Short mmCIF file of C-alpha atoms and ligand atoms in Angstrom, two decimals:
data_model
loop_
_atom_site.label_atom_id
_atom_site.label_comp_id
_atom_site.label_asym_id
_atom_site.label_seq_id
_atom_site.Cartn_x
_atom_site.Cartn_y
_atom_site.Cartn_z
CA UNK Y 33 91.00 125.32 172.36
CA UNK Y 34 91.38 126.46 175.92
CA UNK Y 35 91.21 124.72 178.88
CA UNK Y 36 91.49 121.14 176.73
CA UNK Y 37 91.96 118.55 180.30
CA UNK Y 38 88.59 120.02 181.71
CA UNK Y 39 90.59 121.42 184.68
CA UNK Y 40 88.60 123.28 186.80
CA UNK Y 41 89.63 126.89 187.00
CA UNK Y 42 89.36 129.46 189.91
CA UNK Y 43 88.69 133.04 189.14
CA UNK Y 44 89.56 136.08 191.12
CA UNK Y 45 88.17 138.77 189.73
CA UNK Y 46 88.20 142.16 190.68
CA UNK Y 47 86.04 144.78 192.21
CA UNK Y 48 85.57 146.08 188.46
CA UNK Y 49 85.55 142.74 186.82
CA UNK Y 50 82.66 141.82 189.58
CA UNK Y 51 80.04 144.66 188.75
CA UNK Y 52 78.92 143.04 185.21
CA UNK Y 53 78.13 139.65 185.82
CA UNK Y 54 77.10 137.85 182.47
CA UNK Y 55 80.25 139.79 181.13
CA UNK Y 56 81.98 137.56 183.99
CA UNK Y 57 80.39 134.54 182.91
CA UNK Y 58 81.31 135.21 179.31
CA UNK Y 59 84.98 135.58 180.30
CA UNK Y 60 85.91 132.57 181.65
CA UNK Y 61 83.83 130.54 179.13
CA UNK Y 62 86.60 132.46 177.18
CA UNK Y 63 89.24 130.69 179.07
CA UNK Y 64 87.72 127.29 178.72
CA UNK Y 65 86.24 126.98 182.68
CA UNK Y 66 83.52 125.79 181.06
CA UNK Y 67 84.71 122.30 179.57
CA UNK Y 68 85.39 121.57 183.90
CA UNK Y 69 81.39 121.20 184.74
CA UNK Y 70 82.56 123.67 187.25
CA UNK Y 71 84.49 126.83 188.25
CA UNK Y 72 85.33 128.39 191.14
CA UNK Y 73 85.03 132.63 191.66
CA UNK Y 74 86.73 133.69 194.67
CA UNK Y 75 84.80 137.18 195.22
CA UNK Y 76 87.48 140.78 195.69
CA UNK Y 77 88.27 141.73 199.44
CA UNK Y 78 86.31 144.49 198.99
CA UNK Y 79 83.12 142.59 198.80
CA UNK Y 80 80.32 141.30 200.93
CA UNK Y 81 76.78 139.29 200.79
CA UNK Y 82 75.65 140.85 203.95
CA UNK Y 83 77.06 142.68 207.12
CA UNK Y 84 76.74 139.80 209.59
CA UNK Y 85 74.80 135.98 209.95
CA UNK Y 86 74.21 137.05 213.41
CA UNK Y 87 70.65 136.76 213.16
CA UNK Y 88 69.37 133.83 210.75
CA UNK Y 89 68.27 131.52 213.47
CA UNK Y 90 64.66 131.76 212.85
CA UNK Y 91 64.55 130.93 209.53
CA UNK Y 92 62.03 127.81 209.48
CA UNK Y 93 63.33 124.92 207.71
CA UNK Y 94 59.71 123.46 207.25
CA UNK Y 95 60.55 119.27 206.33
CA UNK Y 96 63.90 118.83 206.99
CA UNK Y 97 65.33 115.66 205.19
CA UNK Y 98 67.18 112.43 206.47
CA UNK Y 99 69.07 111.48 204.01
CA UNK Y 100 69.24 107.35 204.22
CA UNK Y 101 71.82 105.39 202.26
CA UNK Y 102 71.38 101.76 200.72
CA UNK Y 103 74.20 100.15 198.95
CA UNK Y 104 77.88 99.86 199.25
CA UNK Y 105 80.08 102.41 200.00
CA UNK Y 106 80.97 103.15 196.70
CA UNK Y 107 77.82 103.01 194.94
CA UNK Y 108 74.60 103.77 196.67
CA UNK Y 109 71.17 105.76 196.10
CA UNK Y 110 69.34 107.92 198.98
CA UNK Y 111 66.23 108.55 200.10
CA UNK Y 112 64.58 111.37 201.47
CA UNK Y 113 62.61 110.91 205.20
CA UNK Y 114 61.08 113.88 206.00
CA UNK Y 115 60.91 115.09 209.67
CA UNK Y 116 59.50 117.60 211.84
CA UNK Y 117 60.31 121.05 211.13
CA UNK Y 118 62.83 122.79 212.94
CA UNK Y 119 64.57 126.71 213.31
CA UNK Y 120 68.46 126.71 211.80
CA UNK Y 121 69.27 127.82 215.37
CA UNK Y 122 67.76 124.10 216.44
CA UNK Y 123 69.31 122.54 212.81
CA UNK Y 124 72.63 123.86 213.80
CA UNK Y 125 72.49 122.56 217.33
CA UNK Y 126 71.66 119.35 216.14
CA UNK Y 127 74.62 119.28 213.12
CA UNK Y 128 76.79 120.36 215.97
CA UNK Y 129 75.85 117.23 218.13
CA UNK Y 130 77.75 113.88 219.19
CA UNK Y 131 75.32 112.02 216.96
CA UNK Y 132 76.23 114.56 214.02
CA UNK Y 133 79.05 116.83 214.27
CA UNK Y 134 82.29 116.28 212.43
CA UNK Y 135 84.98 114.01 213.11
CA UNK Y 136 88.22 114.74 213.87
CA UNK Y 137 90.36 114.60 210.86
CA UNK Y 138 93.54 115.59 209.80
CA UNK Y 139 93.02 118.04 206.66
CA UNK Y 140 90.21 117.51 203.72
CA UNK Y 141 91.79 114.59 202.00
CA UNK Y 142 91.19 112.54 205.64
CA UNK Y 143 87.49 113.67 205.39
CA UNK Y 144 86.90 112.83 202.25
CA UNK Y 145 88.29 109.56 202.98
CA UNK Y 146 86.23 109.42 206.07
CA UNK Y 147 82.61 110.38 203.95
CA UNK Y 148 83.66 107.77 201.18
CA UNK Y 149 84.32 105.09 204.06
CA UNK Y 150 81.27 105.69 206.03
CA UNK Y 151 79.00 108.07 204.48
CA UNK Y 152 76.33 104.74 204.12
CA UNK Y 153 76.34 103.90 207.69
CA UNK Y 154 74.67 107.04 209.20
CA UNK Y 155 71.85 109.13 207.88
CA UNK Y 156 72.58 113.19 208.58
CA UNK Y 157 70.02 115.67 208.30
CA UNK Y 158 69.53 118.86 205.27
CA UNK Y 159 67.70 121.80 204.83
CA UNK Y 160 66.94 122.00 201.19
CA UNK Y 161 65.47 124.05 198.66
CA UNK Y 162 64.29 126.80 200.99
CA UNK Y 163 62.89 129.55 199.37
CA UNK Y 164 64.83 132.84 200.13
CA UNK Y 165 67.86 134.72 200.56
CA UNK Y 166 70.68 136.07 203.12
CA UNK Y 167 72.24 138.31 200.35
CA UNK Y 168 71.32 142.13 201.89
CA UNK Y 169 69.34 143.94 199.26
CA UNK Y 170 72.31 146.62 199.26
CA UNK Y 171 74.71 144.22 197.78
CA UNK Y 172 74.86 144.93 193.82
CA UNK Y 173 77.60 142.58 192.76
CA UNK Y 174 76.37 138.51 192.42
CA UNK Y 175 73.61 139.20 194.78
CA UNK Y 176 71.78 135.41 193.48
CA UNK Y 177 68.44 137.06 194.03
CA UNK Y 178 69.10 140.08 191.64
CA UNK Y 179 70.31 138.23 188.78
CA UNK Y 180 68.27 138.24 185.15
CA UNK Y 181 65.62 135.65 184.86
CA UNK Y 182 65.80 132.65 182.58
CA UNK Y 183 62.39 133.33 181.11
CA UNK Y 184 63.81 137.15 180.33
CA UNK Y 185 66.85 135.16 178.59
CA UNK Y 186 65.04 133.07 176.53
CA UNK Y 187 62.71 136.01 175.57
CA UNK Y 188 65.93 138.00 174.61
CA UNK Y 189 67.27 134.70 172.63
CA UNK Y 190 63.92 133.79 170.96
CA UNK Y 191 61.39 136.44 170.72
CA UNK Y 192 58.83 134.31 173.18
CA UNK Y 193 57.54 135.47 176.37
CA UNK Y 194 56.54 133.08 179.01
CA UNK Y 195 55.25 132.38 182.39
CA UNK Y 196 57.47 131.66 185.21
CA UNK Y 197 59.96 132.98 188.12
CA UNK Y 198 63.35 132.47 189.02
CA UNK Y 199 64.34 132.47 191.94
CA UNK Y 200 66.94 131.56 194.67
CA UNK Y 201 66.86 128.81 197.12
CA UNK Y 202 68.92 127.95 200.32
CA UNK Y 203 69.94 125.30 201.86
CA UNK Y 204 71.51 124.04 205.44
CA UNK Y 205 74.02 121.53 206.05
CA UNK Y 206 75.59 119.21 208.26
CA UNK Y 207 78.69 116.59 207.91
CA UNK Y 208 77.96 113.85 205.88
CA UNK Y 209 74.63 115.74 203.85
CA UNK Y 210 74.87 114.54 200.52
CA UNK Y 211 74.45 115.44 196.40
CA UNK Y 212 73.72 112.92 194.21
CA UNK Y 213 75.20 113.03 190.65
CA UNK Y 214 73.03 115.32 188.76
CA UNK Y 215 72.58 118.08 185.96
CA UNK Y 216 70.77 120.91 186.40
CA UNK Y 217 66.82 120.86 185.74
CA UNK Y 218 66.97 121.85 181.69
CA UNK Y 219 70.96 121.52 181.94
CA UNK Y 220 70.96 125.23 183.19
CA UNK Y 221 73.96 126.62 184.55
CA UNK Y 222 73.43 126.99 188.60
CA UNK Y 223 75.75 129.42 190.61
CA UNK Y 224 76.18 128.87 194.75
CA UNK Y 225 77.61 130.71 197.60
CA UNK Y 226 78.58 129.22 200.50
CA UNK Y 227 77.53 131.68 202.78
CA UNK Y 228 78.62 130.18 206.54
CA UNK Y 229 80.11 127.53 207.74
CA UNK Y 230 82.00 124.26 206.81
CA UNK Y 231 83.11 123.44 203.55
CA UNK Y 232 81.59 121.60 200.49
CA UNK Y 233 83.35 119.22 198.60
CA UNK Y 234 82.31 118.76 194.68
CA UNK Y 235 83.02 116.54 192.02
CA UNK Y 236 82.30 117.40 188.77
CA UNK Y 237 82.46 115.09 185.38
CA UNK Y 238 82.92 117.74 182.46
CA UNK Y 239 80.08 118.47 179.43
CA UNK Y 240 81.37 116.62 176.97
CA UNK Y 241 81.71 113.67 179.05
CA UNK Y 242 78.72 113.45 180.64
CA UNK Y 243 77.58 110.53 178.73
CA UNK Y 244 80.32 108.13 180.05
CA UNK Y 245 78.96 108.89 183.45
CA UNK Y 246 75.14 108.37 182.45
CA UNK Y 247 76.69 104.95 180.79
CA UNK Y 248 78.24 103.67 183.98
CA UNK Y 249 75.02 104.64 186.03
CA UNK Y 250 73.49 103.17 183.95
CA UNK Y 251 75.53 100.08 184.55
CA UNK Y 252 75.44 100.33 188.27
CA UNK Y 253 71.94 100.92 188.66
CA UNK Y 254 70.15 98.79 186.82
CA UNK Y 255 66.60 98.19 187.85
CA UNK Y 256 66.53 102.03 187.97
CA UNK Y 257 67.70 102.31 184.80
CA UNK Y 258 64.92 100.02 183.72
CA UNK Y 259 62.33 102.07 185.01
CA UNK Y 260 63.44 105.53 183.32
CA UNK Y 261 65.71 106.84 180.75
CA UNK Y 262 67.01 109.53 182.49
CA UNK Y 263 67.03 108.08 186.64
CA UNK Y 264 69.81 111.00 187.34
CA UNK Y 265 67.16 113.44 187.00
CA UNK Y 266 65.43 111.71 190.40
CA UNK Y 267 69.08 112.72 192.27
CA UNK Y 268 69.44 110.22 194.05
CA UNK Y 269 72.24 108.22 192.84
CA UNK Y 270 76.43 108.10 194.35
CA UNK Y 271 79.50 107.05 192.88
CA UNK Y 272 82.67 107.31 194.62
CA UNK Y 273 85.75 108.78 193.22
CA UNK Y 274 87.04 105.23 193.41
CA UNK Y 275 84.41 103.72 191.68
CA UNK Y 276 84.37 106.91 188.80
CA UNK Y 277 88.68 105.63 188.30
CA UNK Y 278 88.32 102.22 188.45
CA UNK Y 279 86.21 102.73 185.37
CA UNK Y 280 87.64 105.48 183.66
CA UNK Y 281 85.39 107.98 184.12
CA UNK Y 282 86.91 111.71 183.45
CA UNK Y 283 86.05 113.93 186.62
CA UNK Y 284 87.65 116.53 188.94
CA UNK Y 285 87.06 117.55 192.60
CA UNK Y 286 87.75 120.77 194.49
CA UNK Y 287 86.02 121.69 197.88
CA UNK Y 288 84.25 125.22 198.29
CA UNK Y 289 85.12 127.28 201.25
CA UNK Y 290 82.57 129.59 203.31
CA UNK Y 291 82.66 133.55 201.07
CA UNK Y 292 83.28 131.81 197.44
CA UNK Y 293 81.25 130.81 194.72
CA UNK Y 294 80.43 127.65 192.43
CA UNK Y 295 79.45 127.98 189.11
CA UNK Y 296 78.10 124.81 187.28
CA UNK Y 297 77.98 124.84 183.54
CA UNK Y 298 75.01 123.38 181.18
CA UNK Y 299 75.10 119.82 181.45
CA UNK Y 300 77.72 119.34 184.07
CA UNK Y 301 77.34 116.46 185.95
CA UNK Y 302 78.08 117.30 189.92
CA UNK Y 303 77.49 115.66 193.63
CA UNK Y 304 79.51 115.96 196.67
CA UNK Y 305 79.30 116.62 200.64
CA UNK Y 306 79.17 119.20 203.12
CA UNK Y 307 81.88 118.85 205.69
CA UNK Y 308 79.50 120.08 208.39
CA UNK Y 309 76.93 122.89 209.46
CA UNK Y 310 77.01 125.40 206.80
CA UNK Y 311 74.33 127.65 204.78
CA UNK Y 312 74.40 128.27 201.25
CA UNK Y 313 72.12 129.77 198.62
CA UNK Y 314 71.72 128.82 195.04
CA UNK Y 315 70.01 129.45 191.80
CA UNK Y 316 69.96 128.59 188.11
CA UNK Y 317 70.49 130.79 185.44
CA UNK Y 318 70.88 130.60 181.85
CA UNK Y 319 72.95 132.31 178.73
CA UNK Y 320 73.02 132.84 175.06
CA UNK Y 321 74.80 129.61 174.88
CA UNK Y 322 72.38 127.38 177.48
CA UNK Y 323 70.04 127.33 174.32
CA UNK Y 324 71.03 124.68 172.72
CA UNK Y 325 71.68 122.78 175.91
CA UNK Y 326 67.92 123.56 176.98
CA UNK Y 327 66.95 122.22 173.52
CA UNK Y 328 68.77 118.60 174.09
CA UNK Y 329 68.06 117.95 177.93
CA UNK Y 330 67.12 114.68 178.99
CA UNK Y 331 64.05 114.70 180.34
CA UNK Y 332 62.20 112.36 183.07
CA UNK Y 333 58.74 111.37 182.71
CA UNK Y 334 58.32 108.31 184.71
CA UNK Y 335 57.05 110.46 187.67
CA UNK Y 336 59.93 110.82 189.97
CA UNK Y 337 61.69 113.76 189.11
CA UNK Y 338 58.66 116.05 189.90
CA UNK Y 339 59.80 119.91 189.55
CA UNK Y 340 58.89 123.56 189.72
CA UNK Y 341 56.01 125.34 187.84
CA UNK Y 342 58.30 127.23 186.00
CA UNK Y 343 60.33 124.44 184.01
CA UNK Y 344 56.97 124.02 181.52
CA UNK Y 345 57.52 126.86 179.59
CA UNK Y 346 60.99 125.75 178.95
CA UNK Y 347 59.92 122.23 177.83
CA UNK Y 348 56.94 123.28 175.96
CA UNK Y 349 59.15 126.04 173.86
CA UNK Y 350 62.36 124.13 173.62
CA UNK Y 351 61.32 120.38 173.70
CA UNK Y 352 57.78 120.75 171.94
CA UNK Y 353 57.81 116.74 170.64
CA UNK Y 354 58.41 115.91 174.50
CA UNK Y 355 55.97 118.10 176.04
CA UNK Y 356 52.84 116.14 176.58
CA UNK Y 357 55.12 112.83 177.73
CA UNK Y 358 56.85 115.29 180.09
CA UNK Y 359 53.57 116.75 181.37
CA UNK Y 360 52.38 113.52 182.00
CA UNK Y 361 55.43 112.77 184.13
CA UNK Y 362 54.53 116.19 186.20
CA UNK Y 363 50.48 114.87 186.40
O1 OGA U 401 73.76 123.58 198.10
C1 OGA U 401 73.64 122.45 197.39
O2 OGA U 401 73.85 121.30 197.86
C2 OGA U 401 73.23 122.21 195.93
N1 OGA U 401 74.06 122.71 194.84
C3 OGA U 401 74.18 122.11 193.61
O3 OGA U 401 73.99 120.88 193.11
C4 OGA U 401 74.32 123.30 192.71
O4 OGA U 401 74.38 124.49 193.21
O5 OGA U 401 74.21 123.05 191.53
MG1 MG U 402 66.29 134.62 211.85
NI1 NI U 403 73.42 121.16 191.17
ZN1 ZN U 404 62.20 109.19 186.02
#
């Protein structure tokens, strides 16, 4: 079995390795990355999303979000204040003030101290789940909005066509934003570039772990708990690397740099921090072997979660017996 301590593994393919992408994807679920949660791809020299961000401060970000902590250090949930809108050229002003910016710190492993320490006593500022793209429509390799749709995929796997669209979202950062410990809606796989800017630091508890860490959240959040079988799904719960050791909870961390890409694997739990300003762009996408991930996701229908059109088709088909519970949950 390859990769059997769920390291996380870093690619670096070439410019020939980088023109087929599911092939890609295929290969280094042949060398085990996926058992990590997570993989890095470091993209060839010769590539490039787009010629220059030179000109991206117009982009609205229509509600940013405050993220506010309550808790301890170690172990705390966040909610989501919504504020005026704002430009990125005014967002990055504002990451790049005295009230926001970075600290100074030595190397990562002082930030990262720095987040866990503090993270609870300020609330920063994120762009999220902005509909669009900064990949130019010239670039053929991993461009994240030319990839093939999950409702093609499962219509390839499974002879059903369905409603739906797929398609890519960005997001703007600042020191201190914050991911809570999630999967991916469906346990897709998602794939992010970090397009500009400051790093991101991930950690990542592998697949076939992922119940220890639903256990313990369980255990350390237990009025939400109470009120929904699958709480993660709302994203809004942290647990520090600390906190993951102390009780023996498998998980890795590695921090993304501006130019590479994150891949996160069906059910692969993942949360981390951005280190300060920064852009990137995500999607999810799916495989052959998502299926029978998609077929076994928890689902939350306590009203929280609340989620895109698109994810009822996958319910419907692949979770049939949960469908009208789940609906009710989106109604
Ligand atoms: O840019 C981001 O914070 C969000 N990314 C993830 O949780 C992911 O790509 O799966
Ligand atoms: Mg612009
Ligand atoms: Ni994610
Ligand atoms: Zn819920």
């Amino acid at each position: 079995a390859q990769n059997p301590n769920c390291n996380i593994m870093i690619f670096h393919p070439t410019k020939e390795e980088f023109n087929d992408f599911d092939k890609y994807i295929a290969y280094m679920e042949s060398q085990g990355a996926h058992r990590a949660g997570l993989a890095k791809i470091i993209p060839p020299k010769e590539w490039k999303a787009r010629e220059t961000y030179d000109n991206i401060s117009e982009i609205l970000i229509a509600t940013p979000l405050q993220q506010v902590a309550s808790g301890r250090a170690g172990v705390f949930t966040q909610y989501h204040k919504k504020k005026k809108a704002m430009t990125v050229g005014e967002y990055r002003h504002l990451a790049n003030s005295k009230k926001y910016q970075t600290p100074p710190h030595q190397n990562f492993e002082d930030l990262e101290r720095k987040y866990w320490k503090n993270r609870i006593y300020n609330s920063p500022i994120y762009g999220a789940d902005i509909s669009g793209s900064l990949f130019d429509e010239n670039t053929k390799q991993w461009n994240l909005g030319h990839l093939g749709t999950i409702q093609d995929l499962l219509e390839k796997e499974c002879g059903v066509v369905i409603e739906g669209v797929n398609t890519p979202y960005l997001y703007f950062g600042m020191w201190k934003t914050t991911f809570a410990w999630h999967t991916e809606d469906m346990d897709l796989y998602s794939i992010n570039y970090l397009h500009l800017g400051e790093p991101k630091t991930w950690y990542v508890v592998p697949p076939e772990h992922g119940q220890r860490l639903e256990r313990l959240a369980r255990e350390l959040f237990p009025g939400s708990s109470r009120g929904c079988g699958a709480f993660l799904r709302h994203k809004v719960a942290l647990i520090s690397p600390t906190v993951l050791k102390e009780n023996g909870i498998p998980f890795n961390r590695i921090t993304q740099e501006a130019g590479e890409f994150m891949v996160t694997f069906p059910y692969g739990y993942h949360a981390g921090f951005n280190h300060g300003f920064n852009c990137a762009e995500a999607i999810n996408f799916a495989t052959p072997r998502w299926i029978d991930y998609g077929k076994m996701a928890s689902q939350c229908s306590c009203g929280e979660a609340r989620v895109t059109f698109s994810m009822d088709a996958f319910v419907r088909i692949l979770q049939p017996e949960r469908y009208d519970l789940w609906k009710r949950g989106q109604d």
